């Protein structure tokens, strides 16, 4: 067994660090695959960071892993940082690839290929779960906040890129000029799923409407992925594959 | 560079690039190189490619070794997707600014919404200098000049590092105490209600309130600075002005077209009728970025890429001048190593063995006529 | 002794090999790696593909066979101290699996995103995919299978049955590799675009979700750790 | 039959249903086209038919009129701008093998449910 | 006696009747059967439809009612030998059901495929469908219901409850008949084509899957066979 | 349109680019039958071995 | 043009004019392949007798 209380504590600390590494990097891999293949196109390009599709899609598809990891970590250890660890791992993987591949391998500028910020939503999700331990309350209120705070959380970063520029006779934002100048041979302009206007776009409502739709869909996706993570937390054994 | 892989018939019948020109072959950092030319949208546009209702004038290149300063279709700037009409000819112009030193193969390409990339001829352009000398200045409507290479980079780094630090602080605050096995055992063995106690709830309330307040304050501050912002400018642009070409005075009818398997030559029998009032002579056959030239009739002086240029690759059985009103049938052979290098011979693998191309007819004075030909391409094995 | 310096090697081997792979693809990405029908593409990337596939098959066979042959027959007469040592070794295996999963499913997957967004897709065997689909994915598959086999053959907790969360954690991410068939099919037939969020990529997404079974796997390993040498201290 | 034989033998050997779903279904998907190639290969001999290139199967479909089945209904390979080299058959075969893994996994449990032996007290 | 020559009749009646039906549709397929508004279409196929629907309703009523009225009241005092005899009779019923299912769901269904691929669909009541939707499908439905009723009323194993696999095996393939509404709706409103793999046909597919309940039904009949006269020999 | 004669007299010859003339009525029919019968026999042999 | 500015119940008012479909039709709007000539009004305060 273990020699004494002290050796047991040291063993528990070593296990803590190693298991934290395992959880963090398995989450990084899986969450990054999911994110980059469900929101990566918007996350890649400043001229894709629009008010309709980026704001709508990103929180919805990104609340998945935080919900599952929360349903496991909070329930089994009372550790209220499942959402934060998921978001931090995603941001770390994204930034490593942006810096060493998007800017390292190819030479796209960082101010063009920066990722979106998600920590505010993760913090809301985690604190709303720890306080008021109800998973239903989290899925309703915290996921609402996660969806709603996405665009305001990223506005300090992207706002300077939205300064209007008179570019060769046409009006373009700085992000538009970045996308125009830094040629993406594989990514033509029409692939861009961004706000283009509609006849039913009333007033100045594009960003808030998208944010509220994302918050509602985030409630739904959090509810589903809480139970998905519950299943993934099972400890069953099989007698035969 | 991504061509030689696409289907030969698809490369033959989508878009025909001609009158291509390059302002320079070798440039310094920050120097501009301009690519001009015309492209014709083939009438027999393959059904597997969506019609070019939404098309983007792009540049084929290994990442931003150049930046696209300007691009024009007709005479107007096209930073967005454009609508093209099948059968129309458009003139284009792309202005590129050198950014990264090296030898780069630059293609003019057209991306079509539901068909994928249509890559035109590529030319090797040498860039010399240092990437550190590259500047991309723009002047905003708010009266400030910024360099797009590093503008907002510090702000982006700062905000991302700040939020990452907040998340790491949360995790570390909870990670000071033992993490996994003792907490699991406490939760399992009896009610836990001991690993989360004040001031843990107070710290969480502080984290939540600070997060919301900081987001609100940062948004307000980023609104006071940069008070003038516009959304991303997007949307397909209609009304591209096509070229007003005169009707050709040469009519060509393709009677059978064959290519040997294996081989590097394509043979076709054409019935050419010369209208107008000047003797004509066949000078060029362009099929897919490959120009087969009859050297006795026409010579290329625009610096066309050598691996795509067959100076004497076009042999006409009777290439004597064709008097006006006269109709004659000749055997035309287009032979060059490019036919196999660019895998034009791999049309035998294609599910649609039809070719298309452009014939260029020249009179004595030097003025030229462009006629388009398309026919089934029959392989010959025996 | 307990936790030894095998963890240092586990981190360092992946780190060094993948740093060299990144250097290799930085040197031969363009210039022998852009034109898939060019002769130097064959000697710098097709040869890489052949060598890496052969070495992966050989290494998987040798490692899995050795782990299965050296399996502990008398698991009943295993002392708690040796059980704790084996639990730490299994945790080192899980650390190696997590590191390999990171390198495969985050780094080289998004790296292939950038590559395919900046160049024209030229083949099914581009330099980026050679490094992602056929090197990093097989490497993490081999590591995960080895960790599963080690748990089953040395840990009495993971013996006497196949752990469902471990099986999911090991096989789901493996299914990303045959899913490449959907990727190639969905890039050549469906979606004449380079949209990274296209439904042709949802095969990676769905089977990337199965890595969430690491949660059940890790609570199982915690219970295996806390069998005889659970303390005391812990809950005392 | 070749795919069926692979599926059956891979199950009897290595009794694992998971191993069958992964390896045997892979083989079932992959061996389909090579298994049928000896039959359809003679129908793919090229023919110069009234000025156009057609395979023998194409001429069969053209000649033997299917009033209810016009040509455009045919869901066959027609070429794309992203069809790189000679990859159409292998790419389709590997996609079919992966999807066969998935469908086998689902239908194993579907068959389990259909093999249930329950009784109901009332419909 | 045990298994008697009712099995020969069970095979032969379906074989002979459907061979005659095939001869009839070969003779009157074209030439009174191509034009649905022609007068001879009414006397050769609409009359066929009317007669077959009336006869199917009458035969179903008579057969099911007789089987239910002659149901065994004193199932407790049934000897194992008579139980074995009744199990063999029920197996003959299942053989007849399988034969009718073959004729309905394979022969005439693909035969309707060919017909609808070679001619222009002219009506909802074409000769092919008259033989497939309104003859062969009702015939196998009647046979399946009769087999289910016989099991429930003569076999103590299948008494005292409704067997779920048997109910699925009997009712699912029945649901293919009301599914014809989707077929006609999906051919006149959806899909102006003759694609046999169109989603308008997935109603037949889904309810054709329910015939897989024959596996549970057959293990139930095996257990019913092996109640008292299970052997010995079997496992001895 | 009235057609007279016998279906047995119908011929559908085509000449391939490989220099062989075949009748589309029966070309490849024997090969198709052979391969299908061979694979069916293999499957039946498997089932009968277990049966 | 408008035939009248002030009408009685059951009285007819006629609205005439021309409309030109702009060449640079925005891509977010589907092409007017299926279009309906409608009247903007707060419910059936008028009935549409005819439209041409
Ligand atoms: C503290 C208690 C009192 C306040 C309560 C909130 C009332 C609304 C405030 C509007 C402020 C504003 O700015 O208007 C809204 C702005 C537009 O503004 P505008 O362009 O100036 O339009 C001027 C013309 N109006 C006056 C007619 C607007 O965007 C929007 O359309 C946002 C639309 C969001 C739709 C989805 C909401 C889902 C809610 C879910 C709840 C669980
Ligand atoms: C626990 C939950 C915390 C939520 C914190 C919310 C911070 C407030 C942000 C102000 C929004 C704004 O200022 O206006 C809306 C702007 C969009 O502006 P734009 O179209 O980009 O215009 C560009 C010009 N700018 C720079 C001036 C904007 O941002 C958004 O679309 C996000 C809208 C979400 C706000 C919903 C809050 C309603 C209360 C929630 C009730 C249940
Ligand atoms: C359970 C639900 C509780 C509701 C609580 C609402 C508190 C609002 C706090 C102030 C937000 C603000 O002022 O900002 C809202 C911004 C305004 O955006 P803007 O005008 O485009 O630009 C920015 C202009 N500023 C800088 C002056 C703000 O975004 C929106 O358009 C969203 C407004 C619609 C909200 C609909 C909520 C319906 C609730 C129904 C309850 C029965
Ligand atoms: C889980 C089991 C995984 C199995 C697969 C492993 C793949 C290994 C790489 C394949 C290389 C190939 O195939 O290419 C062979 C290359 C082709 O380069 P060259 O033209 O000779 O140029 C000169 C060589 N440079 C360009 C590398 C300088 O040359 C070689 O011989 C060298 C290959 C060295 C690989 C071993 C070092 C790895 C980093 C150190 C920490 C481990
Ligand atoms: C768990 C995975 C194990 C992999 C084992 C692979 C063994 C290959 C056996 C030879 C096949 C052959 O030679 O044939 C392959 C044929 C070639 O087709 P072709 O060139 O069009 O024409 C026919 C030309 N012949 C007649 C000369 C063959 O089809 C293909 O294109 C498929 C090739 C891609 C396979 C990708 C596998 C990736 C594995 C990754 C492992 C980490
Ligand atoms: C025995 C161990 C070593 C061999 C291992 C296999 C390596 C690949 C061999 C290629 C042979 C060949 O023929 O190439 C592949 C041929 C094309 O060939 P081509 O037209 O000549 O193109 C020449 C230009 N290239 C050299 C750039 C190719 O089709 C294909 O694109 C097949 C693509 C299949 C995609 C889906 C694969 C999913 C794998 C799942 C694994 C679990
Ligand atoms: C247990 C699994 C058993 C699998 C047996 C496979 C038999 C090999 C067939 C050779 C393929 C070929 O020769 O090339 C590919 C051809 C396609 O050619 P095509 O485009 O029709 O060209 C027409 C001209 N021909 C006639 C020359 C072809 O066939 C296929 O697309 C099927 C590809 C599947 C091969 C995958 C094998 C890789 C190893 C599996 C690893 C995990
Ligand atoms: C599960 C319960 C199923 C119930 C439905 C059964 C449908 C029966 C057929 C309907 C016929 C109809 O409706 O047509 C009536 C037909 C119309 O042909 P005709 O113009 O008189 O030409 C002369 C008749 N020939 C063309 C048949 C030669 O004539 C008849 O009287 C003859 C019908 C004979 C049916 C009985 C023989 C069946 C094969 C022997 C093994 C059983
Ligand atoms: C009818 C729906 C209206 C909203 C109520 C939903 C909350 C239900 C959550 C629940 O089931 O109870 C969990 C805890 C129990 O803690 P208690 O020991 O009851 O603490 C009571 C003292 N307190 C007011 C400071 C909380 O109690 C809490 O969850 C926190 C209660 C305080 C409300 C505000 C917390 C949420 C902050 C965003
Ligand atoms: C993409 C969808 C996510 C996959 C999750 C599905 C898991 C389904 C559960 C499962 O696999 O059941 C196993 C049974 C075999 O049972 P046994 O081997 O008898 O185990 C006894 C205990 N047990 C019955 C509770 C399992 O059924 C079997 O026949 C064995 C098959 C086991 C395969 C599960 C591995 C899944 C890896 C992808
Ligand atoms: C980690 C994953 C790597 C692949 C291994 C997956 C196979 C697992 C299947 C399984 O659960 O075990 C079932 C049988 C058990 O039979 P045993 O009695 O263990 O036979 C051992 C002797 N043998 C090597 C000839 C088999 O053992 C077998 O299934 C057969 C074992 C031999 C491997 C090759 C069989 C497959 C042929 C295509
Ligand atoms: C297309 C989808 C495939 C169909 C498979 C679905 C089968 C669902 C299972 C089911 O039917 O449950 C029966 C219960 C009635 O229960 P009871 O009649 O009380 O039987 C007692 C034992 N039992 C509760 C386990 C059944 O629920 C009821 O109320 C009776 C309804 C039974 C209908 C099942 C027949 C399905 C034929 C299509
Ligand atoms: C946790 C993942 C770390 C990924 C770092 C990476 O990709 O490094 C490659 C990149 C390459 O850029 P650079 O350092 O300038 O060296 C260029 C060499 N090539 C072109 C071969 C990559 O930078 C380094 O090598 C820094 C070493 C970090 C050690 C953890
Ligand atoms: C879980 C959500 C899945 C939604 C699928 C989707 O977005 O598909 C878009 C695509 C519409 O094609 P589009 O985006 O116009 O593709 C343009 C590029 N091409 C024409 C080359 C495919 O629709 C389909 O072809 C059917 C997808 C079936 C999913 C099981
Ligand atoms: C296991 C299903 C057997 C289906 C056989 C069939 O459809 O037979 C009709 C067909 C009709 O062609 P043929 O024999 O030439 O006689 C033509 C008569 N009509 C046109 C009425 C079908 O051939 C026979 O009658 C052969 C007898 C097989 C007995 C199992
Ligand atoms: C389980 C897969 C179901 C996929 C459905 C499908 O393939 O539908 C094709 C069809 C596309 O129509 P299309 O194939 O172009 O039909 C051409 C013929 N017309 C125009 C007469 C219908 O889409 C729909 O109309 C929606 C189908 C809903 C399924 C629940
Ligand atoms: C769509 C979410 C369904 C998640 C499945 C969870 C099943 C738990 C059974 C123990
Ligand atoms: C999609 C496959 C689901 C199959 C259902 C099986 C349920 C078994 C419960 C006993
Ligand atoms: Cu190139
Ligand atoms: Cu043209
Ligand atoms: Cu107008």
UniProtKB/TrEMBL annotation, chains C, E:
Record's keyword terms, sorted: Membrane, Metal-binding, Monooxygenase, Oxidoreductase, Transmembrane, Transmembrane helix, Zinc
Broad EC category: oxidoreductase
Residue sites binding Cu(2+) 3 per the record: 183, 201
TM region positions: 6-24, 44-67, 88-109, 129-151, 163-182, 202-223
InterPro entries (alphabetical): NH3_CH4_mOase_C, NH3_CH4_mOase_C_sf
Pfam annotation, one family: AmoC
Enzyme Commission number, as recorded: 1.14.13.25
MF (Gene Ontology): metal ion binding; methane monooxygenase [NAD(P)H] activity
Residues annotated to bind Zn(2+) 1: 112, 116, 129
Residues the entry annotates as binding Cu(2+) 2: 183, 187, 201
Binding site for Cu(2+) 1: 112, 116, 129
Protein name, per record: Ammonia monooxygenase/methane monooxygenase, subunit C family protein
Species of origin: Methylococcus capsulatus (strain ATCC 33009 / NCIMB 11132 / Bath)
Taxonomy of the source species: Bacteria, Pseudomonadati, Pseudomonadota, Gammaproteobacteria, Methylococcales
GN (gene name): pmoC1
